[PDB]
């Protein structure tokens, strides 16, 4: 037997990096409901005459 396996836990234990980053964001949705309007200014303004 072994006197104190209590302290030898650190050495024995291994790493399984399978739960790392095991998630993702919801699928993109703004495409269906919103349209992209590329711009390069600080405050874009839209104008329509009715």
């Amino acid at each position: 037997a072994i006197i104190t396996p209590a302290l030898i836990s650190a050495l024995k234990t291994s790493f399984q990096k399978h739960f790392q980053d095991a998630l993702a964001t919801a699928p993109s949705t703004y495409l269906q409901v919103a349209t992209v309007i590329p711009s390069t200014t600080a405050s874009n303004t839209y104008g329509w005459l009715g």
Binding site: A1, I2, I3, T4, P5, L7, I8, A10
Partner: protein, 101 residues
């Protein structure tokens, strides 16, 4: 450590060996100078040039003071067994002994 080879006449004797652990924490150290820029830009032969040599010598000497301060902290700090590195009641073995008086 593996036990001594005792007398084998009747039957072989199984032994437990032993198990101890020692957790440690790392530390950082300052090496900052912070000297005016004009001196380095206007540096000449003799001053502010061997400053890197001073840095290197201090870095090389660092383990000396590190170890010696640690030893000076022998009574304050502890060993794997848990008690102070220099105590009179070390519970290492049933025959309790004291490594300092």
């Amino acid at each position: 450590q593996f036990p001594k080879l005792r007398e084998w006449i009747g039957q072989r004797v199984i032994k437990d060996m032993a198990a101890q652990g020692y957790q440690i924490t790392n530390k950082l150290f300052e090496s900052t100078v912070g000297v005016k820029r004009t001196d380095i830009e206007d540096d000449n032969l003799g001053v502010y040039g061997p400053l890197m040599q001073e840095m290197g010598r201090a870095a090389g000497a660092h383990p000396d003071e590190l170890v010696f301060a640690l030893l000076k902290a022998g009574n304050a700090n502890l060993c794997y067994d848990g008690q102070n590195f220099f105590d009179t009641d070390h519970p290492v073995y049933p025959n309790v002994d004291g490594t300092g008086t």
